[PDB]
C-alpha cells in the first residue's frame, strides 16, 4: 500500500516486546519500507486460502494475543533480510530485494510453517505439540532460506538433494538464531516446540539421533516416507556442519572445528556457486571442499576441517 513509513510496537509469541515497521495508510499496516522491496505480513483469519489480508491495525500497538504471531513473522523476516544482506552480500531471497511476504493464523491448530514457492505461511499450532511457529526465529529463517535455495542451487525436494535442501535450511536457519543472538543453540524449534516440555525441539544438529535421526551414512533412510526421508537424512549433513563449526571426534573421526562465521560461508558459497538440483551428499561433500578452497586455499585449515566432517558422518 502507499503511504507513510512508520514505527509500532507490540509483542511476540513469548511476550517480548519489539518495534516493527509499519505502513500508515488510513490503518497501520504490517509492511516494512526499510528493506528491500517490502516486508509485507497478511492474516490468513484460520483459513487456508493465501495470502489473506495485508495485516491492518487501527493504533499501531500490536500487544493482542491475536497479534503476536504476526508480530514475529514480520520481525524475524526482517532479522532474516539483515543476515543474508549484511553477512552474505545477498538482498533478500532472489538476489534481487523481492518482497517478502508471510502469512499467520493459518487454518486452525496447524502444527507446521512453510514457504509455498511465493510466501511464508505459518500455523497457530495446536498449544499442545506448538505454539504458533512464527515465535521461532530458526522456524522463520529455516523456511526463508528454502526461497534462498529454490532460488539458487534448487535441490530438488526428494532423497538426498531433498536432504541437503532440509539440512541447508536448518544451517541457517541456526546461524540466524546465532546472528540474532538470543538463547542461540544447535536444535530447531525450541522456543515454539511442546510448550510443557523443557529442552526439547523437532531436530537436533549437534546429535540427530537425540530425536531418532540418522548422524552417519551408513543409516541412512532409504524408504519413500517424507519424500525419501527429507527431514529424516538431513541429520547426516547436519551432523557435518556441526563438525564444521564447532568440531568433536564422532565415530573415532576428528573434527577440527572453524567457527560459525566460517560455516557460513563455505556452505553459502556452495549452495549459490556449486550445488544444482540433482546434487547428492557426495556432491555436496566436492561442493563444500571447492567452496572452502576458493575462500580460504587448498592447503587451509578450512578444506582439512571440510574433509574430515564428511569423513565422519560417512560421506565420501
Ligand atoms: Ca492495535
Ligand atoms: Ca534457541
Ligand atoms: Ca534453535
Ligand atoms: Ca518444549
Ligand atoms: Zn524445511
Redesign the pocket.
Known amino acids: 500500500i502507499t503511504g507513510t513509513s512508520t514505527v509500532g510496537v507490540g509483542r511476540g509469541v513469548l511476550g517480548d516486546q519489539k518495534n516493527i515497521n509499519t505502513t500508515y495508510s488510513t490503518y497501520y499496516y504490517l509492511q516494512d519500507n526499510t528493506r528491500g522491496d517490502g516486508i509485507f505480513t497478511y492474516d490468513a483469519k484460520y483459513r487456508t486460502t493465501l495470502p489473506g489480508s495485508l495485516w491492518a491495525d487501527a493504533d499501531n500497538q500490536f500487544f493482542a494475543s491475536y497479534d503476536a504471531p504476526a508480530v514475529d513473522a514480520h520481525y524475524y523476516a526482517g532479522v532474516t533480510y539483515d543476515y543474508y544482506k549484511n553477512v552474505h552480500n545477498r538482498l533478500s531471497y532472489d538476489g534481487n530485494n523481492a518482497a517478502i511476504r508471510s502469512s499467520v493464523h493459518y487454518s486452525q491448530g496447524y502444527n507446521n510453517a ?2 509455498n514457492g511465493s510466501e511464508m505461511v505459518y500455523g497457530d499450532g495446536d498449544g499442545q505439540t506448538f505454539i504458533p511457529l512464527s515465535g521461532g526465529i530458526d522456524v522463520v529463517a ?2 526463508l ?2 526461497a534462498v535455495t529454490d532460488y539458487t542451487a534448487g535441490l530438488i525436494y526428494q532423497n538426498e538433494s531433498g536432504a541437503i ?2 539440512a541447508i ?2 544451517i541457517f536457519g541456526t546461524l540466524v538464531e546465532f546472528y540474532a543472538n538470543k538463547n542461540p543453540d544447535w536444535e530447531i524449534g525450541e522456543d515454539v516446540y511442546t510448550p510443557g516440555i523443557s529442552g526439547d525441539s523437532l531436530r537436533s544438529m549437534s546429535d540427530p539421533a537425540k530425536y531418532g535421526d540418522p548422524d552417519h551414512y551408513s543409516k541412512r533412510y532409504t524408504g519413500t516416507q517424507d519424500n525419501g526421508g ?2 529424516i537424512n ?1 541429520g547426516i549433513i547436519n551432523k557435518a556442519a556441526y563438525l564444521i563449526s564447532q568440531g568433536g571426534t564422532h565415530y573415532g573421526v576428528s573434527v577440527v572445528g572453524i567457527g560459525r562465521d566460517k560455516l557460513g560461508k563455505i556452505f553459502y558459497r556452495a549452495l549459490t556457486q556449486y550445488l544444482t538440483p540433482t546434487s547428492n551428499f557426495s556432491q555436496l561433500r566436492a561442493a563444500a571442499v571447492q567452496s572452502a578452497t576458493d575462500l580460504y586455499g587448498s592447503t587451509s585449515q578450512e578444506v582439512a576441517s571440510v574433509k574430515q566432517a564428511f569423513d565422519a558422518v560417512g560421506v565420501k
Open positions: 512453510f514457504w529455516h523456511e532460506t528454502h535442501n532440509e535450511s536448518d527429507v527431514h538431513s
